[PDB]
Design a protein around this ligand. Sequence first.
Ligand SMILES: [Mg+2]
Ligand SMILES: [Mg+2]
Ligand SMILES: [Mg+2]
Ligand SMILES: [Mg+2]
Ligand SMILES: [Mg+2]
Ligand SMILES: [Mg+2]
Ligand SMILES: [Mg+2]
Ligand SMILES: [Mg+2]
Ligand SMILES: [Mg+2]
Ligand SMILES: [Mg+2]
Ligand SMILES: [Mg+2]
Ligand SMILES: [Mg+2]
Ligand SMILES: [Mg+2]
Ligand SMILES: [Mg+2]
Ligand SMILES: [Mg+2]
Ligand SMILES: [Mg+2]
Ligand SMILES: [Mg+2]
Ligand SMILES: [Mg+2]
Ligand SMILES: [Mg+2]
Ligand SMILES: [Mg+2]
Ligand SMILES: [Mg+2]
Ligand SMILES: [Mg+2]
Ligand SMILES: [Mg+2]
Ligand SMILES: [Mg+2]
Ligand SMILES: [Mg+2]
Ligand SMILES: [Mg+2]
Ligand SMILES: [Mg+2]
Ligand SMILES: [Mg+2]
Ligand SMILES: [Mg+2]
Ligand SMILES: [Mg+2]
Ligand SMILES: [Mg+2]
Ligand SMILES: [Mg+2]
Ligand SMILES: [Mg+2]
Ligand SMILES: [Mg+2]
Ligand SMILES: [Mg+2]
Ligand SMILES: [Mg+2]
Ligand SMILES: [Mg+2]
Ligand SMILES: [Mg+2]
Ligand SMILES: [Mg+2]
Ligand SMILES: [Mg+2]
Ligand SMILES: [Mg+2]
Ligand SMILES: [Mg+2]
Ligand SMILES: [Mg+2]
Ligand SMILES: [Mg+2]
Ligand SMILES: [Mg+2]
Ligand SMILES: [Mg+2]
Ligand SMILES: [Mg+2]
Ligand SMILES: [Mg+2]
Ligand SMILES: [Mg+2]
Ligand SMILES: [Mg+2]
Ligand SMILES: [Mg+2]
Lengths: 58, 50, 51, 159, 148, 223, 185
Amino acid sequence: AKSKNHTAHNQTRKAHRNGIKKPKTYKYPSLKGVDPKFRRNHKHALHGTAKALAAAKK
Amino acid sequence: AISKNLPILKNHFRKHWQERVKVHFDQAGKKVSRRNARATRAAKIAPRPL
Amino acid sequence: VLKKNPLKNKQVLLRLNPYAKVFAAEKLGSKKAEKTGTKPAAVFTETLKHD
Amino acid sequence: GKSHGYRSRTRYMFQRDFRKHGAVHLSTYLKVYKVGDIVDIKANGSIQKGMPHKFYQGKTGVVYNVTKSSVGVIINKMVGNRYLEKRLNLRVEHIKHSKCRQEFLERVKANAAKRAEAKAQGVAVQLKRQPAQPRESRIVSTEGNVPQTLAPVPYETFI
Amino acid sequence: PSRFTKTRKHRGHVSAGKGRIGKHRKHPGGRGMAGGQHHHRINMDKYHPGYFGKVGMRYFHKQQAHFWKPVLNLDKLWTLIPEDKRDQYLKSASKETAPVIDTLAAGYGKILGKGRIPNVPVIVKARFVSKLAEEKIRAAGGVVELIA
Amino acid sequence: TAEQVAAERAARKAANKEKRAIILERNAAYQKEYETAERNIIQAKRDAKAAGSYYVEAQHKLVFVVRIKGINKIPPKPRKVLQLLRLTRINSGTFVKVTKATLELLKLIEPYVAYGYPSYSTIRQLVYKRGFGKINKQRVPLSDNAIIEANLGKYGILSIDDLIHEIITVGPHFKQANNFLWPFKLSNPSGGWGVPRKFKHFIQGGSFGNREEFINKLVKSMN
Amino acid sequence: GIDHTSKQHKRSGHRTAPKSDNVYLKLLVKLYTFLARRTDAPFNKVVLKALFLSKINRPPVSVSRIARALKQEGAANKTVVVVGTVTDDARIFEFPKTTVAALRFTAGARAKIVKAGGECITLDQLAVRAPKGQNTLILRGPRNSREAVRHFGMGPHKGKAPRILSTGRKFERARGRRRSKGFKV
RNA sequence: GGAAUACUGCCAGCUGGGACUGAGGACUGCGACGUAAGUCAAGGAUGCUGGCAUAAUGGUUAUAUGCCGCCCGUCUUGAAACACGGACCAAGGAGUCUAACGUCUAUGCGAGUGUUUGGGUGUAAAACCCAUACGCGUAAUGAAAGUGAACGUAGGUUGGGGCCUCGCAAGAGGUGCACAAUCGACCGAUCCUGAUGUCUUCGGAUGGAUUUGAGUAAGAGCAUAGCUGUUGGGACCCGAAAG
RNA sequence: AAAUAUGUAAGAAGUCCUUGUUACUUAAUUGAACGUGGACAUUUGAAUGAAGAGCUUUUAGUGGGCCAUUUUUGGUAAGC
RNA sequence: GCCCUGAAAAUGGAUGGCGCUCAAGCGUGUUACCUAUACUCUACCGUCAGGGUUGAUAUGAUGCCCUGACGAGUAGGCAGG
Ligand SMILES: [Mg+2]
Ligand SMILES: [Mg+2]
Ligand SMILES: [Mg+2]
Ligand SMILES: [Mg+2]
Ligand SMILES: [Mg+2]
Ligand SMILES: [Mg+2]
Ligand SMILES: [Mg+2]
Ligand SMILES: [Mg+2]
Ligand SMILES: [Mg+2]
Ligand SMILES: [Mg+2]
Ligand SMILES: [Mg+2]
Ligand SMILES: [Mg+2]
Ligand SMILES: [Mg+2]
Ligand SMILES: [Mg+2]
Ligand SMILES: [Mg+2]
Ligand SMILES: [Mg+2]
Ligand SMILES: [Mg+2]
Ligand SMILES: [Mg+2]
Ligand SMILES: [Mg+2]
Ligand SMILES: [Mg+2]
Ligand SMILES: [Mg+2]
Ligand SMILES: [Mg+2]
Ligand SMILES: [Mg+2]
Ligand SMILES: [Mg+2]
Ligand SMILES: [Mg+2]
Ligand SMILES: [Mg+2]
Ligand SMILES: [Mg+2]
Ligand SMILES: [Mg+2]
Ligand SMILES: [Mg+2]
Ligand SMILES: [Mg+2]
Ligand SMILES: [Mg+2]
Ligand SMILES: [Mg+2]
Ligand SMILES: [Mg+2]
Ligand SMILES: [Mg+2]
Ligand SMILES: [Mg+2]
Ligand SMILES: [Mg+2]
Ligand SMILES: [Mg+2]
Ligand SMILES: [Mg+2]
Ligand SMILES: [Mg+2]
Ligand SMILES: [Mg+2]
Ligand SMILES: [Mg+2]
Ligand SMILES: [Mg+2]
Ligand SMILES: [Mg+2]
Ligand SMILES: [Mg+2]
Ligand SMILES: [Mg+2]
Ligand SMILES: [Mg+2]
Ligand SMILES: [Mg+2]
Ligand SMILES: [Mg+2]
Ligand SMILES: [Mg+2]
Ligand SMILES: [Mg+2]
Ligand SMILES: [Mg+2]
């Protein structure tokens, strides 16, 4: 027999019991999908800028 | 049926397994037999060593 | 243990706020206003009683 | 059957502005985008490439990446009961610097300036925005302004 | 023990724990792994990717422990030498009265290079070592003796 | 020990003596502050009239809100605003500082509340009879001045009339003063609501919405 | 009624004693709650709590984990607290001196420590020497090193681990585990 | 022109009648009035008088009186239903045991762990003792041949409880295990690079890459037990038409 | 071309000055990213609230719905 | 505006009933009064939270003590008995 097809009734009630939150947040965020050459060079600008600091401790 | 995040088990019990269950209730009393018959072997083997 | 309400029972009324003693003493829960003869300008009454 | 193609229901969303069809002006191509820039997404349907899906029409987000012809933008999007992180590859033609952030930066520059000219006087600042307050007392005068007094109007058909 | 069991708590509530609408019927959805490729597919992908289909080469009459080659890292190595005897060899540090460790006798079958050992010579007898394991031994004044 | 006692004690017996002199001094000061201010706006009105003008008064900075609708069948938006002003139970009421940012709140919520411009009288009696403070959650009744000073002293305010003043005048730490104040639990109006149905607007025949300086007669009967 | 904004009668989701029943532990608690209460000293409040932990949240602290935390600047002479049980690690050689307060020590672990002229106190001993927990270095173990937690998150592209009862090719290494067999993960 | 009054609001102005309550049980608090000694309505009731003995009173019960109350169980959006089961009562009557497991918890030992196939021994199916192995764990990765975990205080950055120093504090610096985020290094797979060599076709050093692994990066595991949950089993109990 | 709804922002993960790293990029020590060092804490950048925030694991039931105001489709209509 | 006509269905009946005509009807206004498991104050039970406390000192330390808030419930979860 035929039955109800669709509804969003009650769905925001359900979503808002323990939900929405926000999105989680971080300094130094994921580098997913950033320009590979730049990453490659960033890699090197970091090793260097590291190095140079340990040289400043002797 | 299949559900939840569990490992896939492979328990072969689709075959009248209960007709063939060997429960070692005699583990105890058989130790006594295995002794008592080692003892009485050691006898008639004179002074020989089992 | 028991809430007492200063709006009755003078004791807790005086526990909080001592100034009540004097407040009462000087009345000033009344206290006459001053006095001024400042009358209202003509246009004020013209408009008031206007149609 | 129902039809839920990629650009469905977008007949008026991706139309151009009345008497603003044709070449997209050069300004658009001269604005420069760094990471951490807050961009407004608004598709241009003449530039078919690098198009934002219709969801993101009207949505603001932050650049996470910069490329030859497009920025990558991070959008937070609610699905179900939670925001998910969304990475968009949009050509610059569909993107705009968000003025509201420029109000902010300009205000931050203001608030460092105000703060200086106070320590240079050792006086107090009062830097937070206050919201629109009540109103203080006034004395309006009747000089040249004797209140015209009005009354309600009769009914009258004009047809 | 049954005394602590939930079904004791349930006595007197209809329908056990199992509900009124949805019953506790006799295998909805099928027995065991039924409909893996069908109605039980969302669970089978995620939670068990890879489950379906073949992969790789077959091997008839394979005999485990034809491949018996248990591993040992330098990371330990000195465990193979008896505790009390160890201190002695640790300080003696000599290339001339270097200790011998028969790893195959210990039950191992390949030395691997994880970790560091101290500069003390060791004669290590084994079958198979990692290119790096023997590099560290050799650099601590020891050598590797291949056996069988 | 037998002597170190009547040191700290008569220290504080007479240290109390002072804290009380200061209250005594402020409380009087506040009277003046009030008596004058209210006289001012009177004569201000009579002058303006005398000079053919009209002293139009300062817009109220303070309103008291009582919630009069219960807790069922409330729309999500006003329901939220209802809670953010701590009106979460029928006939409970709090003070609200009026700015545009709070005014638009009142608006949103207007069918469920009944509010207006309180008076020193109504506030005095509301804080005295129904004043409870917030200390580590706990709703603690203000029966001794020490409690306020132990909690609100940092912002001045070491008495109950220090609490009152900071409200009626709004002023600097109103926020923290008012928040300290647990929502007032009023009764139902002894005397009645003065109207057949309450869930129309005051302008339409009763309750709900801004009834302005009528809120006092209302509160006082719920107090 | 009340338009509750908060779930009524909720319990602080926090252990409050050990679930354990070792009378000696309950005694150790009875000690450190006294300390925790009658002092300031953050240390005791922290140890108190950490006695409540379940065996999973008390992963073992290793003897190499101790030694390495002792190469910290200005720490060589502190006394390392390990509200848990310290184990032995054949992998460090030169091992320093120091006194270590733990709950339990494995056999080899009180060896190693002692042999190096070091000490093995108990927390109620530690209590006496350091009422306010002075000169102490608290060390916890690696929780996430557990094998259970390997399978937490198991989903497509989460890159976690299957719960499989036995591994090899022929065990969930095909469809869904590679591009050539449908799709990958 | 000078008043009154209404209406409205204020008083820490003064008072009469009626109702319900009296929690607490030494003292500690904040006050009040007193010139004082002291007194008090100030962190919860005392005082005075009287009534009751085969009784005053209270509990149960029956009945009457006022108001109110459809039959439970069940499936259902909806049952008191003109939906079903149930005339009545007693006894019986339905989530179990098992093999293999997931999470969590207790306990033992811990880089190991599991005495019980078996042997020893016994106050004899118990308890006490043990040699070799074996299982799981301590190495991963490839279909495989195979190869196999430190550039570095076992790395850098950011939070980080605790502890250390300065301080009377407020604070400031130092170190920062667990845990989280992030950049890097190591191991195997893949694709490049292809030195020193050799028997010319073997050999694969070195350095790499938006690829990749259920890995490394000072181990956590093994075992006994319990609740809950999973799969095979008669599988909570009763039930086909059939074969 | 509304109303109602709807995105984002309102700071220590900030602002400023100095000058470090790199194989990216620039005609270019030019930029770009990431840093060292220095300075700036009363309101440190609107309101109101906060009954604490954050986080993990695991499992039950459920997976026939229906009603009212308002918006609204089919139908003459319907307790459709 | 109110009232009248337009206005026909099957057991005998329904402004809830009686009955009501300057209403006990219709429109409007003013006060007073009645009454929910709701609101205000207090006792008691429980649940949850915060705090004090075996310092040498008889009988529960999973205890004693002080304080605040809260309490609907099928299917279902856990807990104490
Ligand atoms: Mg159907
Ligand atoms: Mg239907
Ligand atoms: Mg459906
Ligand atoms: Mg359909
Ligand atoms: Mg038999
Ligand atoms: Mg269509
Ligand atoms: Mg449209
Ligand atoms: Mg044109
Ligand atoms: Mg194309
Ligand atoms: Mg139950
Ligand atoms: Mg139930
Ligand atoms: Mg049933
Ligand atoms: Mg599925
Ligand atoms: Mg190892
Ligand atoms: Mg009242
Ligand atoms: Mg009256
Ligand atoms: Mg009355
Ligand atoms: Mg009226
Ligand atoms: Mg460090
Ligand atoms: Mg870990
Ligand atoms: Mg591991
Ligand atoms: Mg009493
Ligand atoms: Mg009697
Ligand atoms: Mg009866
Ligand atoms: Mg009836
Ligand atoms: Mg009847
Ligand atoms: Mg039906
Ligand atoms: Mg029924
Ligand atoms: Mg019927
Ligand atoms: Mg039926
Ligand atoms: Mg009968
Ligand atoms: Mg019957
Ligand atoms: Mg029977
Ligand atoms: Mg029976
Ligand atoms: Mg292999
Ligand atoms: Mg049958
Ligand atoms: Mg048959
Ligand atoms: Mg057949
Ligand atoms: Mg919004
Ligand atoms: Mg706030
Ligand atoms: Mg669930
Ligand atoms: Mg579910
Ligand atoms: Mg389901
Ligand atoms: Mg169903
Ligand atoms: Mg008819
Ligand atoms: Mg009839
Ligand atoms: Mg009508
Ligand atoms: Mg009438
Ligand atoms: Mg009327
Ligand atoms: Mg009641
Ligand atoms: Mg309940």
